[PDB]
């Protein structure tokens, strides 16, 4: 089997009520205090609005939850409660219901997001270090709280590039980590799915989020977004293997006794592991240092166990300029 190298037992060591979200009873406040201003987006199970609290004029974001198992709602609510105060985790202001329909909604702090497509073409070297460090604070926090996000991607990382504020949003796929538990591999967005998901390995952990973070780092330093652009879940693994290597994939599978869907036989081909320097060219050279490549190499690894933890990544020399500035 497999276990997280960090925070493996932290839910076991807490009160059952911490992680037994099905038993959680939220306190549902009154949505009538909020005026919806504009639609910001629509997810598979929610729609999101900018809003104003009419009682105090606070600008907020209201996530109206579409009908789903109330179990999934309790999970997201309990996770957000447990993460209260966490650095760079979106702040849950309240849990409310339409007082007539009883439809639930989550009220979050507002962030003035700069859409990532334009932003990621204009970041400086220091900006990338800064924002990756801020995102790592959120991941180390949630991992330390026994929670895997399972959907790290640019669309879930709100960045106010004027105030230099970052928040990790959309905890609707997040789950509690318990050692030896088998999890659904149908999580994360295609381009950010770790190889463990793509090969149907269910005994994954916090390190899934570190793969996704590595994908984001690669896209920022190299200016190829998304970095691994699969056409489907099968092709996603092929795109990874064309960089990390096919023999290297097979060694990973063998180590964890992972069975490979035979449809991969016709599409993986044979590929040597590539040097990360191969992705450097005149348009991105100013963003790519030895430190950046060393960090990236330690995140984008097949073996989920040997990827850096969020804390190990934060301690890497790549972030020394950020730490010194935050003196
Ligand atoms: C214009 C962008 C700002 O958007 C914000 C800002 C603050 C807080 C949140 C969002 C947000 C949330 C959620 C979603 N957005 C957006 C991306 C549409 C979509 C998926 C579900 C979700 O939770 C926030 O919590």
Curated annotation (Swiss-Prot):
Transmembrane segments: none
Residues with N6-acetyllysine modification: 91
Modified sites of kind Phosphoserine: 12, 15, 282
Keyword Transferase in annotation: yes
Intracellular or extracellular location(s): Nucleus; Cytoplasm
Catalytic activities: L-seryl-[protein] + ATP = O-phospho-L-seryl-[protein] + ADP + H(+); L-threonyl-[protein] + ATP = O-phospho-L-threonyl-[protein] + ADP + H(+)
Binding site for ATP: 40-48, 63
Protein function: Catalytic subunit of a constitutively active serine/threonine-protein kinase complex that phosphorylates a large number of substrates containing acidic residues C-terminal to the phosphorylated serine or threonine. Regulates numerous cellular processes, such as cell cycle progression, apoptosis and transcription, as well as viral infection. May act as a regulatory node which integrates and coordinates numerous signals leading to an appropriate cellular response.
Name used for this protein in its record: Casein kinase II subunit alpha'
Chain's gene name: CSNK2A2
């Amino acid at each position: 089997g497999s276990r997280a190298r960090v925070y493996a037992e932290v839910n076991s060591l807490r009160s059952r009520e911490y992680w037994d979200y099905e038993a959680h009873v939220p306190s549902w406040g009154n949505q009538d205090d909020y005026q919806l201003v504009r639609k910001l987006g629509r997810g598979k199970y929610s729609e999101v609005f900018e809003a104003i609290n009419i009682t105090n004029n606070e600008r907020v974001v209201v996530k109206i939850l579409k009908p789903v198992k109330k179990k999934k709602i309790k999970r997201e609510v309990k996770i957000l409660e447990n993460l209260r105060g966490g650095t760079n985790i979106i702040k849950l202001i309240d849990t409310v219901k339409d007082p007539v329909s009883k439809t639930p909604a989550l009220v979050f702090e507002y962030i003035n997001n700069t859409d990532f497509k334009q932003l990621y073409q204009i970041l400086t070297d220091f900006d990338i270090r800064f924002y990756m460090y801020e995102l790592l604070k959120a991941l180390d926090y949630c991992h330390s709280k026994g929670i895997m996000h399972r959907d790290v991607k640019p669309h879930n990382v709100m960045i106010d590039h004027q105030q230099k504020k970052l928040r990790l949003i959309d905890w609707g796929l997040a789950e509690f980590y318990h050692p030896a538990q088998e999890y659904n591999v149908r999580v994360a967005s295609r381009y950010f799915k770790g190889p463990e998901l793509l090969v149907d390995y269910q005994m994954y952990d916090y390190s899934l989020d570190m793969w996704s973070l590595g994908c984001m780092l690669a896209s920022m330093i190299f200016r190829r977004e998304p970095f691994f652009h699969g056409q489907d879940n099968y092709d996603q693994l092929v795109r990874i293997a064309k960089v990390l290597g096919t023999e290297e994939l097979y060694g990973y599978l063998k180590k964890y006794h992972i069975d490979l869907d035979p449809h991969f036989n016709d599409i993986l081909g044979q590929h040597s592991r590539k040097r990360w320097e191969n992705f450097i060219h005149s348009e991105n050279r100013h963003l790519v240092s030895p430190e950046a490549l060393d960090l990236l190499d330690k995140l984008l690894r097949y073996d989920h166990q040997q990827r850096l933890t969020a804390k190990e990544a934060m301690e890497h020399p790549y972030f020394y300029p950020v730490v010194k500035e935050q003196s």
